Design a binder for this molecule. Sequence first.
Ligand code: SAH
Lengths: 265, 265
Amino acid sequence: MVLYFIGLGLYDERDITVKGLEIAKYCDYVFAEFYTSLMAGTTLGRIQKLIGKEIRVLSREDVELNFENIVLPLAKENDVAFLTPGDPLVATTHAELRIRAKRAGVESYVIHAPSIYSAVGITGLHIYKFGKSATVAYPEGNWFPTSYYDVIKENAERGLHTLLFLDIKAEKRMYMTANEAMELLLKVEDMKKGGVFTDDTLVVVLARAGSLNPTIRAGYVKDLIREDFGDPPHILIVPGKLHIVEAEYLVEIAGAPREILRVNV
Amino acid sequence: MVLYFIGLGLYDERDITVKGLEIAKYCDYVFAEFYTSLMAGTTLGRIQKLIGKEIRVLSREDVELNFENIVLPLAKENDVAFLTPGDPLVATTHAELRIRAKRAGVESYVIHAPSIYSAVGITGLHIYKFGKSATVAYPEGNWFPTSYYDVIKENAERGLHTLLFLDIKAEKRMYMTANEAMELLLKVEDMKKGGVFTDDTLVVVLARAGSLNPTIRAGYVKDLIREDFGDPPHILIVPGKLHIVEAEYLVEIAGAPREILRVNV
Ligand SMILES: Nc1ncnc2c1ncn2[C@@H]1O[C@H](CSCC[C@H](N)C(=O)O)[C@@H](O)[C@H]1O
């Protein structure tokens, strides 16, 4: 009688922690959601094979509206696991589900897994220098989200880097690319004209983190906006002022223009 | 010809990912460093037994001064693994090691694992609201560093949370407790009087993240300063203004006082 929130990691079924896998194997029922992020290097079948259980996938509605009706009931007489991509409580609203588990008299435990939030360390940018994060959401109807632009502005003014989660429409299988994010940002710039995001802005793209060969690229928007970064998921980063060692890594590992080595102190 | 940076995760020998374990077993030689952080929930012996490999531990000097003489030579003609606590490259000095590998004509790949940076999501605080991060360092001699206090001020001022890594003397295996961190912050406050950290400041303590029984506590400094949060490692967080959902999680999961539901939202 317990509910486990277990993260599956960044890219494939092997990104789950050993602890998570062993626990998942001891569970009676296994549920999961694959709408908060995209695991581009595996399939449900492969995940099911590793765990050795039949995984029942839930939609955003099943979870947000009926988690206490689909999962919690079974957790009262069995050990149940709820699997999610990356880390279960990062950039998701799953934390609140623990409250539902409590109010249902069910004890819950959390098993972490690699998260894109920390995986960005592979870009060479100092993790402690990342400020507030934001999500670039697809505009819909007459609604055109722009809050992420102000986040970049605020962080940049403080010399902090900005991590930009990219939008996803799992049911429509739509995964926003870094290219699309840049296009949207250039549009917001023309509107607000704050000089926050332009063709000369240095950005960093990380695609398919977790894979053995993720795409890590750094350069100016004018140069990368049309570059092919490979299959999704993608994450976009707008660095603040760089430390010399950050610039060196971007040049040596992410193929950034050598001119950025010359920092303006 | 290959060097694999493999994260060991948060607390014990099972926090490594399945991918990291299989690759560690696949490698011919395995090195590891325990100076950027420690794995408090296990021992070198237990890690070795899990991997089934002899593990050569490296000191900060071994790595910072002689990485290219100790690790890379073998990586040139063999598959070599370099284990680090948490997620590789979160520690600021790890990144440049990939440049050294490049210089020596050695390929390198990163296998991620959970980091405390993302693991803080278990506190119920929204990850996007975390701003710049900082480390609380023990004062010594005539040196009293206090930049971490300023980090809190700047973050809180913008309604952002502040993750505070607590000092660790890896070699001496000594951990700064949240209690000691709170006392230091109160001292800094008494010196700067910026009204950033007082007895009425709401803080969150996360101890032994990764274990199945971490200590998650939230409350005002005046009540938590002498509380026993259990064995290390301890992490201190000074949240900024809270979203009602964050506050409710702290009350329901971290035993925070109901007062935060009206004072800190
Ligand atoms: N492997 C990966 N590579 C690049 N971006 C990734 C990624 N995994 C997730 N993301 C990014 O983050 C978004 C999902 S947000 C949910 C994140 C998840 N809980 C975690 O811990 O990683 C995606 O739309 C994408 O922009």
